[PDB]
Chain A
């Protein structure tokens, strides 16, 4: 299919052209002939610019009810929170809490909304969300360098300067098996693991090194406007919905301090 582009290039190369000395003096002659009909250049008289009957009053009475209905529905929709769920693949992002998809749940009489767009352009829409959720596989040592760079591409975005980030390190049960088997060497991928020590030892020292790499990119440059909240998940875990609520309480408490100017 390499010849397809060449065919279009050949079709494009054979075209007739005129010189700009005549292609611009023609654009100049269009305005001088239509100059006296653009009101935004020649101000119109103050009495001609367009900017009650028995029927004009019924029109306004009709318009006065739409406003109350709109305001009633908006004030009702004011309540709930809204979350955005990211994560590439191999992680199980669709199995942590139990076009475009949507999901609802509630704990302690507070409703959450979770979205999953099934990203450099459409990310502006989710600019007023409460928190972003990022999921990572903690048993796939080759894609970790991909996940590390995706995390930093998200943390350093332009439209997400004040949006906090929760972080789940998934599939920790496989990591214990892989590390205690002994057939896989972690230093084969990250050489600086040979010097690190902890501040089940072989698994703890392994997982804390994995966490530190993300927390370093986190605390590198944040200026104290948003922060990251790390957690260790598993394949089956029922206590995963309390963490998001306990972390949104701390996102809202740290948000009220800056409107009333107590800091």
Chain B
């Protein structure tokens, strides 16, 4: 599986730009899509969403009006057109895939992003900011405004992980299920508005910032990040 992005460069305000993402290795025409950006020294932020078959689109109110999203299936490409940019549009842009049916797991594979220099809604709170860490058990936490517990029995909270100089990854989906390719050291738990990620038997290559995310209703709000240092 592969998702490589392009575009980028140096741009002056009041201009325009087109970004493209090429995919190779899966049935592109049955996955949703997402664009997600990250400021030079900040967290993650949701931008747009296009569904499968191009039948349902969602934008972000911060950039609604000037952005556009569009996919080309037989060429396996995703497009984002931006017009009349500003100074707050300097960030790294990624590409994310997702699929929805009974029992699936979305947001599983991220890509390699590109940089471009241009010179009510729920809020998630990441209390801690840095923790020194070995083989020592740890614990992290997240909190929301309202209770994510639905009437189906589901609970929509996700956990990610960003190592230095890489793309994020999926660890747990819907607060309790472990993904594919992940060891059993990580685990999940929680309740309504009271969550806790319990990493046990700490090892190397487990250093980086951690985020929580929600999917109960649009828009999709990330967090601020909890960093772990040795």
Binding site for B on A (CB under 8 A): 53-56, 58-59, 61-62, 65
Contact A53 B51 (CB under 8 A): no
Q: Which of A54, A59, A61, A65 has the most chain B CB atoms closer than 10 A to its own CB?
A: A54
Instruction: Flag whether B217 is at the interface (Cβ < 8 A).
Output: yes
A residues less than 8 Å from B215 (CB atoms): 54-55
Chain A proximity mask over B148-161: 1 for CB below 8 Å, otherwise 0: 00101010100000
Which of B35-43, B52-60, B176-184 interfaces with chain A? B52-60
B residues 74-119 with Cβ under 8 Å of A?
100-102, 106
10 A-B pairs with least C-beta separation: A58-B100, A55-B100, A59-B101, A59-B100, A62-B101, A53-B150, A54-B217, A54-B215, A62-B100, A59-B102
Given contacts A53-B154, A55-B100, A55-B106, 7 further A-B contacts (CB under 8 A): A53-B152, A54-B215, A54-B216, A54-B217, A54-B218, A59-B100, A59-B101
Q: How far is the CA of A61 from the CA of B51 in the complex (A)?
A: 9
Contact A62 B216 (CB under 8 A): no
B residues less than 8 Å from A56 (CB atoms): 152
Instruction: Flag whether B225 is at the interface (Cβ < 8 A).
Output: no
Instruction: Flag whether B223 is at the interface (Cβ < 8 A).
Output: no
A-B contact pairs, 6 of them (CB 8 A): A53-B156, A54-B215, A55-B154, A55-B215, A56-B152, A62-B100
Q: How far is the CA of A62 from the CA of B100 in the complex (A)?
A: 8
B residues less than 8 Å from A54 (CB atoms): 156, 215-218
- Min CB gap A216→B, angstroms: 62
Instruction: Flag whether B188 is at the interface (Cβ < 8 A).
Output: no
B residues 190-210 with Cβ under 8 Å of A?
none
Contact B216 A58 (CB under 8 A): no
Please, how many residues of chain B have a CB less than 8 angstroms from a CB on the other chain? 18
Q: How far is the CA of A116 from the CA of B31 in the complex (A)?
A: 43
Instruction: Flag whether B32 is at the interface (Cβ < 8 A).
Output: yes
Binding site secondary structure of chain B: loop
- Min CB gap A7→B, angstroms: 52
A residues less than 8 Å from B53 (CB atoms): 65
Q: How far is the CA of A55 from the CA of B154 in the complex (A)?
A: 11
Chain A proximity mask over B208-230: 1 for CB below 8 Å, otherwise 0: 00000001111000000000000
Q: Which of A53, A56, A59 has the most chain B CB atoms closer than 10 A to its own CB?
A: A53
Binding site for A on B (CB under 8 A): 32, 51-53, 55-56, 100-102, 106, 150, 152, 154, 156, 215-218
Q: How far is the CA of A65 from the CA of B29 in the complex (A)?
A: 12
A residues less than 8 Å from B152 (CB atoms): 53, 56
Closest partner residue, chain A, to B106 (CB atom): A55
A residues less than 8 Å from B154 (CB atoms): 53, 55
Q: How far is the CA of A59 from the CA of B101 in the complex (A)?
A: 5
Q: How far is the CA of A205 from the CA of B151 in the complex (A)?
A: 85
Q: How far is the CA of A59 from the CA of B100 in the complex (A)?
A: 6
Closest partner residue, chain A, to B58 (CB atom): A54
A residues less than 8 Å from B216 (CB atoms): 53-54
Q: How far is the CA of A56 from the CA of B32 in the complex (A)?
A: 14
Closest partner residue, chain A, to B53 (CB atom): A65
Contact B52 A55 (CB under 8 A): no
- Min CB gap A23→B, angstroms: 44
- Min CB gap B22→A, angstroms: 24
B residues less than 8 Å from A62 (CB atoms): 52, 100-101
Q: How far is the CA of A59 from the CA of B106 in the complex (A)?
A: 12
Q: How far is the CA of A56 from the CA of B150 in the complex (A)?
A: 11
Contact A58 B32 (CB under 8 A): yes
B residues less than 8 Å from A53 (CB atoms): 150, 152, 154, 156, 216
B residues less than 8 Å from A61 (CB atoms): 51-52, 55-56
- Min CB gap A53→B, angstroms: 6
